[PDB]
Amino acid sequence: SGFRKMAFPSGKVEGCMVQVTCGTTTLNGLWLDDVVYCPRHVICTSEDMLNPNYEDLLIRKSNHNFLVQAGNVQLRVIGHSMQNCVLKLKVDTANPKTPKYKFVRIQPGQTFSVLACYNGSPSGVYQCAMRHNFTIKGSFLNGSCGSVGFNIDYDCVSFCYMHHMELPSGVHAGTDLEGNFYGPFVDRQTAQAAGTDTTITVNVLAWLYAAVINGDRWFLNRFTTTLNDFNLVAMKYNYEPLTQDHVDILGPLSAQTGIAVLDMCASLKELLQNGMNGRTILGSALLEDEFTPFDVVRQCSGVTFQ
């Protein structure tokens, strides 16, 4: 028992992180097979970032201008290509430590693990969620660009995120591994507002299920509700409207706990209206929304990876 924000074991991704330098700029790349993936803004100076023309900046770069270092090993770049907001560097050596992998573009609400890296070296691992406004709330300092987010399934690593920017508000923006940003963000040092950060309702419900499984039952109430009545409340508190797909995803947890989804929604309603009255749920004094239904089933049934 107990319930923790828990990352995937990072070892498969550690073995893929390299350092990429171009002129004076150093950041992280991901070395899968014989291709190194990195933020295209590796070709930029501090000044370029104010208003980069990436196509023009890229012209003044050749293969040899990209230094790729895996630990101390220097990799040889024999080809480069810009794909959306990421550079692909062809190298002469396949990564021996390449795992089974896929590139996925995730939907808002889905969670993943970040391996925060500096100079091609891993420093730490934490969980986060793709927010409904296409930001993440990470921990990223200068040099962290190219750090990646992922999920693991048995032996397959699904990369879903590459870190590119911090917005002036201090939240984080980046791309999938095809180089398309999540949301409206651009790789330019200009003003960019996020948008309303709505709570991921289906995640909060999952976490309520988790609490119940773990003996934290005080918030269960006598009431039920309707999808429409609940959603009236959700919309007042900037909660994502709950859909019948959401109800479906919560079915297994409903089944294990014997608590119908809508009963759980009525508990949520009363929490939103009355607050927590200074109590906690699973050691938090606010409603947590960065656990997916899958995250809870995982942690509650001890799923394992190779």
Catalytic-residue membership of 41: yes
**Contacts of 125 by beta carbon, 8 Å cutoff, 6+ apart:** 7, 8, 10, 113, 114, 115, 116
Smaller CB separation from its own copies, 82 or 171: 171
Quick check: 10 binds its own copies (CB under 8 A)? yes
Identify the three-state secondary structure at position 192: coil
DSSP string, 49-105: GGS--HHHHHHT--GGGEEEEETTEEEPEEEEEEETTEEEEEESS--TTPPEEEE-P
Contact string (CB under 8 A) for its own copies, positions 277-296, x = contact: -x-x--xxxx----------
Number of residues in the chain: 306
Q: How far is the CB of 130 from its own copies (least distance, A)?
A: 15
Catalytic-residue membership of 64: no
Contact string (CB under 8 A) for its own copies, positions 192-221, x = contact: ----------------------xx------
Identify the three-state secondary structure at position 26: strand
Q: How far is the CB of 4 from its own copies (least distance, A)?
A: 4
Quick check: 5 binds its own copies (CB under 8 A)? yes
Q: How far is the CB of 37 from its own copies (least distance, A)?
A: 19
Stretch that binds its own copies, among 12-20, 30-38, 45-53, 229-237 (CB under 8 A): 12-20
Beta bridge partners, 68, equal 20, 75
Quick check: 184 binds its own copies (CB under 8 A)? no
Q: 10 Å Cβ neighbour count for 282?
A: 18
Report the site for its own copies in 121-140 (rule: CB under 8 A): 121-126, 128, 137-140
Q: Which residue is catalytic, options 38, 44, 128, 145? A: 145
Burial 112-133 (b: 16+ CB within 10 A, else e): bbbbbbbebebeebebbbbbbb
Nearest alpha-carbon partner for 204 in 298, 288, 280, 281: 288
Query: Which residues are tagged catalytic?
Result: 41, 145
Task: Please report, as ranges, the residues that interact with its own copies according to CB under 8 A.
Answer: 1-12, 14-15, 71, 115-119, 121-126, 128, 137-144, 166, 170-172, 214-215, 275-276, 278, 280, 283-286, 298-306
